[PDB]
Scaffold this active site. Structure first.
Site, mmCIF file in Angstrom:
data_model
loop_
_atom_site.group_PDB
_atom_site.id
_atom_site.type_symbol
_atom_site.label_atom_id
_atom_site.label_comp_id
_atom_site.label_asym_id
_atom_site.label_seq_id
_atom_site.Cartn_x
_atom_site.Cartn_y
_atom_site.Cartn_z
ATOM 1 N N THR A 104 0.846 -1.161 0.132
ATOM 2 C CA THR A 104 -0.031 0.183 0.098
ATOM 3 C C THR A 104 0.985 1.190 -0.020
ATOM 4 O OG1 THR A 104 -1.813 -1.166 1.401
ATOM 5 C CG2 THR A 104 -1.752 1.435 1.165
ATOM 6 N N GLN A 105 0.561 2.244 -0.866
ATOM 7 C CA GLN A 105 1.404 3.564 -1.023
ATOM 8 C C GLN A 105 0.100 4.381 -1.306
ATOM 9 O OE1 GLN A 105 0.741 1.573 -3.393
ATOM 10 N NE2 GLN A 105 2.996 1.172 -4.604
ATOM 11 N N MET A 153 -1.128 -6.786 -2.182
ATOM 12 C CA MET A 153 -1.352 -5.331 -1.780
ATOM 13 C C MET A 153 -0.197 -4.492 -1.788
ATOM 14 S SD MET A 153 -4.476 -5.568 -0.351
ATOM 15 C CE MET A 153 -4.615 -4.676 0.936
#
Lengths: 244, 250, 223, 240, 241, 231, 235, 243
Positions: free
Chosen positions: C1-2, C107
């Site tokens: 996730t970013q 993810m």
């Protein structure tokens, strides 16, 4: 590849013997004699150091008798370096048991554990076995005073009196002759020293060539004391028993 | 690739001999003589700096090595094997002792750790034994001064005085006649120099002899002042000049 | 996730009788700051495919390197690398779609929306979409971000269904695309005047037009 | 890790390491098993080359795997401890997951499986041990006696012997054991077991061990004097 | 007789694979020499290009390990380049971890330790090379440290390696017996190179052209190799006196 | 001799004997033929039985709709290699929406076999393969050897007595390459080719195995009464 | 010594060829496939009369529709049976159906060549795998340690195999009944066995579509032995 | 003796016999060459036509690495493919980290270290190929040849395989007669001639010629195969010289 150079340390002979175990036992037969004698009121451990020198610092030296805990000690016959590896493992096992159950490890349980480690090196791993035979002298509240021996095969047995190392055939015959069941520690001390005096390859048995230890309930009231004899104390007991 | 030698290269022969250990001891026998003598107030260890070429700077090759501030070591046998053992011995003194107890190990226990490393090279897969015998001298508060010999098998013994390598048999006889329990450190150094002269062929001076002592604390070698309990290392390597001064009173 | 940092806005495209057209502006935004003004977001692969990318620019540069490596790899031990065994638009898309869905499944997505435009070996028009979620779809017109809301309605007036494609010339299609880019400049706050346009035709091949500008604008009525 | 294939086929189709493991069993002290109508008896030889032994603490030849199953063996003593430990762990694991103690056949099948595994795994040698496993299945009164060997094959026996001079005592059992009428009592079964060992043992003193297992976890080891009474009665009938 | 195939002890306490690795060292039939000046360290080595099809600019046994450290190798080129790559990696890692340039003697020790491992571990063979490391160390000054297949290493005032090392060694010994100092008392590195070439000519009894030699020079903060034209200028100066 | 104990050892003349012994297993195997035109590619294989009660060992394996092979030698090794080809064909279709080129399939088989010839502990594959397929460049025939060598051919044969079929194809080269758009005639040529390798036995209904792939023909295997037409 | 995965100069794997020799020393096992079912029979071969022969288990169930007989080093078969049972049950879990007999056999044979320096050696046992499925009907397979499996109308393995196979060559035809097959296995087992055949030293089994895999009672087999004796005395 | 039974064992000479036996496999292979020209390199190889059934021009031997490097080898063909596969991984990782395509000398060492690593252990076999490779980078043209031992040098011309002695002599003439240099188009013609001349050591079977090149002016520094008219022109030039 690498197979070419593999000695295969864990194989049977055509006769069903383990080559490396047999050869390790041959090595042990040249080591200094160690004797253990069990009495009603204690256990004696006596052992001969191998051809020493006058410049060896004896009072700080230890090659035969080792403490495993406050209740159990061992006499060594074979490669000293190999023995110290196993001794440290045994010391740890005893402490693991004490931490887990809050009771001192029974003698046989410690002996079985070390013997199983020796067994493993004969069945798997492709490594050479430990060239060591032990005499275990110990006390617990189940069986009281106990003597055991273990050898490179990982087999162990219990004894009233036993020897390992050099001249075990001669030593065992002398012990079998003079040992009696109602014997006491002071008598057993004398038997052990007399047996070593007759079986030794040296010219005479002196204090500087011996290591000595007793496990007695000769500790003030219901408890057990280990006594690793000092050089002067070995000299005194040699005079007392009339060997020097 | 992968190390596919997971089996022992040292095994028992029918006669009960461990061949590779015996052969390692033979390599030690060919090595240059080194010795150690224990006095009442110190210990001395010494050896010859057998220079391979006169163009070589033999001061850059250290046969006598500091392991801890109070423990030193010398060898006979294969030099490279010794060098890596000194590296391992220095590290194990920290990892298995100083980082736990906040103090340097006593001589007997560091010797025990070095011995363990040498024992494992005698049983572990795909390795040969170390081709050296070590003489380790040291001091610690509760045991006082001590001297130990460590062999390729991993066996170790404490000595009042001893010698290893080339002319050890003759040197040990020489030491038996001269050693007593009342020797001062200077007397032990004198005896060390006398003993070592017998096994040396060529030049015999401060540049061809390597000698170190375990003696008094050296506050001048500590590198800092202000902490009363820290009094400096007991290990000290003698200089070329210091050796030559004692060769005139020889 | 970013989170996306430096970003590119709409990519728009449509089919016509003999091929496909694709376009995207030359801006790299840093939030509301219009930071980088010379960013090429249409990346040609061979002479039959153009990949248009919006979203995170760092991830775009990574995808650009993957496509460059794909061409190198296809040429290895391939005597027909410039003929029968050249990279097809359909091969390039399926590869990207695989990567996008795998990355969302760990993810750790590539924060992009991608349109692959090209012409196949048999002359068939290829136009398909894929995004950070691995979602894919095809349509006579395709657009990302703001383009989806403003360009598609205009482009769908030209080609409303499949049967309108053969009736649409390259002149009519390009005209529609250029007008849509003007509308986006009027109404998208993260757009620029400068853009690139690429035409992939089954007869005339790949025409890549750089340094195009939005012109014929009306403000006069600023009333 | 050490991966060397120690157990392999030879041109004549033999695995010598497994066959040499059987030679280690041949060297071990004799063990015998006899099942009666309502019991099983395990007899074991003790070589009298070792006196000054402490018999209280010395490892006994018959081992309880659970309260209802026992295991005896011939061959390498150290090897047998590893099989006994594994069997004891599996017995408790079976009680934990199935909520029922092991059947004698199941416990045999497990130990035999371990032995087989050590004949085609890299870096290991076979066990130099053959075992006799005896007992009664939970809530069952039918006697059970099984045998295992280094190769890993196992089978059920009305009566069987393993170890040194086992050829002789099997000869005795084959002519003295009737299948239509097995030893009806504990006495008769123990007597036949002591008789079979007396063909091989030497002195009937501290050389013979006897363990009786009855249904419902009833296991007891006979003492020197109790066995000595069987030894006495057998030879007094023989003097005729 | 498998004690001759892997690195285990023979009955005499010898390691034959190590001894045979020393023999591989002379397979190239090349001799090298190293000397120290006041401010510099010079290393020269014979260059032989036996094939006309070879590109002579790629034939080299001198390596630039770091900015400060140079290394000449005696032995086959595959093992030489193996050692070179490792030495370069070790020097770079050292600077990253400890914040200063790896000293010449420390790199020598590290490579010697690696070599020692090959003599003790069976699965790894020794490298058939002798490594001569040169630099002008910031603490010790001009430095020569040499490593071999046994894992041995030591510092040198000067040194020589190759089939005819003894002739060169004795020649150098005799010069330092006269001068009674540990170095070449000369200001410029150019004259120290001239000394090195002159004494190799004397010892081997052979003349050299510009393409027959290979030269490396270490000064404060850099090690560099000379071109053929730089060597030619050196040869001209030698002939003119 | 002293250099055939493992695959990691060259002989003094630079030979790899374990690889050569693996090659020998193919020569013991039953004959199989491969040939192609510009529109189709055909495999013909003589199946071998154990005895009269037994079935005839299958020789042809399908790898994809457009590719498959025939085997000669150790059958389990063919199963391992054909499984690998199935996976690689499959990876190409799933990831790139692309049918795997026959030439690229040969390259992958070469590299997989090579790793087993340069490392300790392993062994070479003991099987030879004939791969046919139809891709974007038309019909193809490949010959695989467990040495790693893969070769593209118009026709070939491997197995016992394969030399007779190989000579026939070498004569007929100009004829069978021109058999375009006629599957039956191309199979006839293959059945006539494999007949040049028969001795004592002839082609029966449970003996013969045929496979074909082409322009508008998925890889299909014919056995039983489906090959009676060609007997 | 030499690698465990080494090829001979003839192109055969030494260890596989040597395991085949161990199988030749094993007790006989015979299978016969008919349109009414497949029969499996074995020689028990007890080493002593005190050995309880009904504990000798050389015929084994893999699933309701698949049975198996073994010959050679029978201890090696246990992990093969375990794998076969697991494969049969697992396929039913994944696909809600019975597994094909061929597919089961192929799964077992995939274990065979997984040896080297995985297990340390090949299996020293051969298997006759018999069963029924809807697609190919009644089937009999011979699984070897080479990884190869052949389908058979009839097959014998073990020490009396080549004599038995010659006998099966003459006796088998495509119209055999189940009863005829039972007697035929008994007849040929009796021919090659050392000891005299009875219900205690031999064992029969069959697989039918209706009833599945069944090991025959000693009482049931004893009757078939008596029926065999009378029909051989009938001419 | 026994020193030649295991890889990485030093003989009493200081030799690795297993590596020397790998060279024998190389010497048994077909002839392959490399020529360094003014602004690039040319590679050529002899392909033996074992049978009429071999499809012409299909079994391609020369291999590209990245887009600027060509590789050809003689000996065990699979071993060569394994080496090129590694080279392609090395070139990819270099370009990934450093952006620029791998320089030829840098690439040469990557192959060299990998081949040398297969002489360090007895658990692996040395490579049975000698590889001629090169291309154009920022510093110009480079030609290399790499042996089973891991040894490599830069070359003006290079040859390996069964007809290497013949080829080497021809290459040496070109070096002497052209100190100023050879053009790319000249090098292609000369490469065709040398393979035809070297085919005398393999005269039993007929062969197929295969040529490739990288040139700054002729191919923009990219590796390309010589095809069609330019290949036929080189074949004609070669056939004219042998008659």
């Amino acid at each position: 590849g690498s197979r070419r150079y593999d000695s295969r340390t864990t194989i049977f002979s055509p006769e069903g013997r383990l080559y490396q175990v047999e050869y390790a036992l041959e090595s042990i037969s040249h080591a200094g004699t160690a004797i253990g004698i069990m009495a009603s009121d204690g256990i004696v451990l006596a052992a001969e150091r191998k051809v020493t020198s006058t410049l060896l610092e004896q009072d700080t030296s230890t090659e035969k008798l080792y403490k495993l805990n406050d209740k159990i000690a061992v006499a060594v016959a074979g490669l000293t370096a190999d023995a110290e590896i196993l001794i440290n493992t045994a010391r740890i096992h005893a402490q693991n048991y004490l931490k887990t159950y809050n009771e001192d490890i029974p003698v046989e349980i410690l002996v079985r554990r070390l013997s199983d480690i020796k067994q493993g090196y004969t069945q798997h791993g492709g490594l050479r076995p430990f060239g060591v035979s032990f005499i275990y002298a110990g006390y617990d509240d189940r069986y009281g005073y106990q003597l055991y021996t273990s050898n490179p095969s990982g087999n162990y047995t219990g004894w009233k009196a036993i020897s390992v190392g050099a001249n075990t055939s001669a030593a065992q015959t002398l012990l079998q002759m003079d040992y009696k069941d109602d014997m006491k520690v002071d008598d057993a001390i004398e038997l052990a020293l007399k047996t070593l005096s007759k079986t030794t390859d040296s010219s005479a048995l002196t204090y500087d060539r011996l290591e000595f230890a007793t496990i007695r309930k000769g500790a003030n009231d219901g408890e057990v004391y280990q006594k690793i004899f000092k050089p002067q104390e070995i000299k005194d007991i040699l005079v007392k028993t009339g060997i020097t | 690739m992968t190390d596919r030698y997971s089996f022992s290269l040292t095994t028992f022969s029918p006669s009960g001999k461990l061949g590779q250990i015996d052969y390692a001891l033979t390599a030690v026998k060919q090595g240059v003589t080194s010795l150690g003598i224990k006095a009442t107030n110190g210990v001395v260890i010494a050896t010859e700096k057998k220079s391979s070429s006169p163009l070589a700077m033999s001061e850059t090759l250290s046969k006598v090595s500091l392991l801890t501030p109070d423990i030193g070591a010398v060898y006979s046998g294969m030099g490279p094997d010794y060098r890596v053992l000194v590296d391992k011995s220095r590290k194990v003194a920290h990892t298995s002792y100083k980082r736990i107890y906040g103090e340097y190990p006593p001589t007997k226990l560091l010797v025990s750790e070095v011995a363990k490393i040498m024992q494992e090279a005698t049983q572990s897969g795909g390795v040969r034994p170390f081709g050296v015998s070590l003489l380790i001298a040291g001091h610690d508060e509760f045991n006082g001064f001590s001297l130990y010999q460590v062999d390729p098998s991993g066996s170790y013994f404490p000595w009042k005085a001893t010698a290893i390598g080339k002319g050890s048999v003759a040197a040990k006889t020489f030491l038996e006649k001269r050693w007593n329990d009342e020797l001062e450190l200077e007397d032990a150094i004198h005896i060390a120099l006398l003993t070592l002269k017998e096994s040396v062929e060529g030049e015999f001076n401060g540049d061809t002899i390597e000698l170190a002592i375990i003696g008094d604390e050296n506050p001048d070698l500590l590198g800092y002042t202000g902490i009363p309990t820290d009094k400096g290392p007991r290990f000290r390597k003698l200089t070329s000049q210091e050796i030559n001064d004692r060769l005139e009173a020889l | 996730t970013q989170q996306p940092i430096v970003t590119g806005t709409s990519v728009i495209s449509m089919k016509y009788d003999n091929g496909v057209i694709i376009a995207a502006d030359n801006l790299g935004s840093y939030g509301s700051l219009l930071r980088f003004n010379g960013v090429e977001r249409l990346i040609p692969v061979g002479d039959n495919t153009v990949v248009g990318i919006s979203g995170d620019i760092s991830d775009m540069q990574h995808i650009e390197r993957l496509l460059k490596d794909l061409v190198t790899e296809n040429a290895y031990d391939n005597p027909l690398a410039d003929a029968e065994e050249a990279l097809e638009p359909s091969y390039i898309f399926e590869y990207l779609a695989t990567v996008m869905y795998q990355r969302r499944s760990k993810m750790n997505p590539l924060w992009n929306a991608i349109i692959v435009a090209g012409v196949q070996s048999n002359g068939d028009q290829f136009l398909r979409y894929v995004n950070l979620l691995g979602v894919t779809y095809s349509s006579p017109t395709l657009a990302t971000g703001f383009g989806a809301h403003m360009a598609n309605p205009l482009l769908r007036k030209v080609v409303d269904r499949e049967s309108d494609i053969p009736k649409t010339t390259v002149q009519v299609a390009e005209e529609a695309i250029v007008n849509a880019m003007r509308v986006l400049y009027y109404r998208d706050a993260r757009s620029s005047r400068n853009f690139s346009l690429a035409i992939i035709d089954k007869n005339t091949g790949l025409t890549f037009k750089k340094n195009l500008q939005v012109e014929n604008m009306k403000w006069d009525f600023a009333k | 890790g050490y991966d060397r294939a120690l157990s392999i086929f030879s041109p004549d189709g033999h695995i010598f390491q497994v066959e040499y493991a059987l030679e280690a069993v041949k060297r071990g002290t004799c063990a015998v098993g006899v099942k009666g109508k309502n019991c099983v008896v395990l007899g074991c030889e003790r070589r009298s080359t070792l006196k000054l032994q402490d018999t209280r603490i010395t490892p006994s030849k018959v081992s309880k795997i659970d309260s209802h199953v026992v295991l005896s063996f011939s061959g390498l003593n150290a090897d047998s401890r590893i099989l006994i430990e594994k069997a004891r762990v599996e017995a408790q694991s079976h009680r934990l997951t199935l909520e029922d103690p092991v059947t004698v056949e199941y416990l045999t099948r497990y130990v035999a499986g371990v032995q087989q595994r050590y004949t085609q795994s890299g870096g290991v040698r076979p066990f130099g041990v053959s075992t006799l496993i005896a007992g009664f299945d939970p809530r069952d009164d039918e006697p059970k006696l099984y045998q295992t060997e280094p190769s890993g094959i196992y089978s059920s026996w009305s009566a069987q012997t393993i170890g040194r001079n086992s050829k002789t005592v099997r000869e005795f059992l084959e002519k003295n054991y009737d299948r239509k009428e097995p030893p009806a009592t504990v006495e008769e079964c123990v007597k036949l077991t002591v008789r079979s060992l007396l063909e091989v043992v030497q002195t009937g003193a501290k050389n013979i061990e006897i363990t009786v297992v009855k249904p419902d976890s009833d296991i007891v080891a006979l003492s020197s004097e109790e066995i000595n009474q069987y030894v006495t009665q057998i030879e007094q009938e023989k003097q005729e | 007789g498998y004690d001759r195939h892997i690195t285990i002890f023979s009955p005499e306490g010898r390691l034959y694979q190590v001894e045979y690795a020393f023999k591989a060292t002379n397979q190239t039939n090349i001799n090298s020499l190293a000397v120290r000046g006041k401010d510099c360290t010079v290393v020269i080595s014979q260059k032989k290009v036996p094939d006309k099809l070879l590109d002579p600019t790629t034939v080299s046994y001198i390596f630039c390990i770091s900015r400060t450290i140079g290394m000449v190798v005696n032995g086959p080129i595959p093992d030489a380049r193996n050692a070179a790559l490792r030495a370069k990696a070790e020097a770079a890692e050292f600077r990253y971890k400890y914040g200063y340039d790896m000293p010449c003697d420390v790199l020598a020790k590290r490579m010697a330790n690696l070599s020692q491992i090959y003599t003790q571990r069976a699965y790894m063979r020794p490298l058939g090379v002798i490594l001569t490391f040169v630099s002008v160390d910031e603490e010790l000054g001009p430095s020569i440290y040499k490593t071999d297949p046994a894992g041995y290493y030591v510092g040198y005032k000067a040194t020589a390696t190759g089939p005819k090392q003894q002739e060169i060694t004795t020649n150098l010994e005799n010069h330092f017996k006269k001068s009674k100092i540990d170095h070449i008392n000369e200001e410029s590195w150019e004259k120290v190179v001239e000394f090195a070439i002159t004494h190799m000519i004397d010892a081997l009894g052979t003349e050299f052209s510009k393409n027959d030699l290979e030269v490396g020079v270490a000064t404060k903060d850099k090690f560099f190799t000379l071109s053929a034209e730089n060597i030619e200028e050196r040869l001209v100066a030698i002939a003119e006196q | 001799n002293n250099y055939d104990g493992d695959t990691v050892t060259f002989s003094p003349t630079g030979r790899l004997f374990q690889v050569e012994y693996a090659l020998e297993a193919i020569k013991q195997g039953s004959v199989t033929v491969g040939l192609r035109s510009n529109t189709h590619a055909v495999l013909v294989a003589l199946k071998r039985n154990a005895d009269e009660l037994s079935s005839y060992q299958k020789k042809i394996i399908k790898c994809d709709e457009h590719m498959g092979l025939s085997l000669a030698g150790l059958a389990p090794d063919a199963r391992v290699l054909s499984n690998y080809l199935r996976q690689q064909c499959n990876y190409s279709s799933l990831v790139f929406n692309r049918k795997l080129a026959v030439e690229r399939a040969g390259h992958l088989l070469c590299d997989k076999a090579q790793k087993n010839t340069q490392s300790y502990g392993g062994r070479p594959y003991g099987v030879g393969l004939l791969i046919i397929g139809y891709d974007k460049s038309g019909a193809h025939l490949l010959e695989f050897q467990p040495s790693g060598n893969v070769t593209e051919l118009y026709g070939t044969a491997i197995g016992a007595r394969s030399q007779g079929a190989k000579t026939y194809l070498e004569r007929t080269l100009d004829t069978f390459i021109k058999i375009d758009g006629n599957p039956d005639e191309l199979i006839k040529a293959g059945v006539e080719a494999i007949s040049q390798s028969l001795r004592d036995e002839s082609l029966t209904v449970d003996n013969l195995s045929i496979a074909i792939v082409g322009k508008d023909t998925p890889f299909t295997i014919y056995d039983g009464e489906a090959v009676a037409k060609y007997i | 010594d030499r690698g465990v995965s080494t090829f001979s100069p003839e192109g055969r794997l030494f260890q596989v060829e040597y395991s085949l020799e161990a199988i030749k020393l094993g007790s006989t096992a015979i299978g016969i496939a008919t349109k009414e079912g497949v029969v499996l029979g074995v020689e028990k071969r007890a080493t002593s009369p005190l050995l309880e022969s009904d504990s000798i288990e050389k015929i084994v169930e893999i699933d309701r529709h698949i049975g198996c007989a073994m010959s050679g080093l029978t201890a090696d078969a246990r992990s093969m049976i375990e794998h076969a049972r697991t494969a049969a049950v697992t396929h039913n879990l994944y696909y809600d159906e019975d597994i094909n007999v061929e597919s089961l056999t192929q799964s077992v044979c995939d274990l065979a060549l997984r040896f080297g320096e995985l297990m340390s050696r090949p299996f020293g046992v051969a298997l006759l795998i018999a069963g029924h499925d809807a697609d190919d009907g009644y089937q009999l397979f011979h699984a070897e340690p080479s990884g190869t499996f052949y389908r058979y109308n009839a097959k014998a393995i073990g020490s009396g195999s080549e004599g038995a196979q010659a006998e099966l060559l003459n006796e088998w035809h495509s119209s055999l009944t189940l009863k005829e097959a039972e007697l035929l296995v008994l007849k040929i087992l009796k021919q090659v066995m050392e000891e005299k055949l009875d219900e205690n030293n031999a064992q029969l089994s069959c697989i039918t579509k209706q009833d599945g895999f069944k090991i025959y009672d000693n009482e049931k087999t004893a009757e078939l032995i008596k029926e065999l004796k009378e029909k051989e005395a009938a001419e | 003796t026994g020193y030649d039974l295991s890889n990485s064992v030093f003989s009493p000479d200081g030799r690795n016999f297993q590596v020397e036996y790998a060279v024998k496999a190389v010497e048994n292979g077909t002839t392959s060459i490399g020529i360094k020209c003014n602004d690039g390199v040319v590679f050529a190889v002899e392909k033996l036509i074992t049978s009429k059934l071999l499809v012409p021009q299909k079994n391609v031997k020369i291999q590209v690495v990245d887009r600027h490097i060509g590789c050809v080898y003689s000996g065990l063909i699979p071993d060569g493919r394994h080496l090129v596969n590694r080279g392609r991984e090395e070139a990819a990782s270099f370009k990934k980290l450093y952006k620029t395509p791998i320089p030829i000398p840098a690439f040469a060492d990557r192959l060299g270290q990998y081949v040398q690593a297969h002489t360090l252990y007895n658990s692996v076999r040395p490579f049975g190929v000698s590889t001629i490779f090169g291309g154009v980078d920022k510093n110009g043209a480079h030609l290399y040849m790499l042996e089973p031992s891991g040894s490599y040098w830069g070359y003006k011309g290079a040859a390996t395989g069964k007809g290497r002695q013949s080829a080497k002599a021809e290459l040496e003439k070109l070096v002497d007669h052209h100190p100023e240099g050879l053009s790319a188009r000249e090098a292609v013609k000369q490469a065709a001639k040398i393979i035809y001349l070297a085919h005398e050591d393999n005269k039993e079977k007929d062969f197929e010629l295969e040529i490739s090149w990288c040139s700054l002016s002729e191919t923009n520094g990219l590796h390309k195969f010589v095809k069609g008219d330019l290949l036929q022109e080189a074949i004609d030039f070669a056939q004219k010289e042998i008659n």
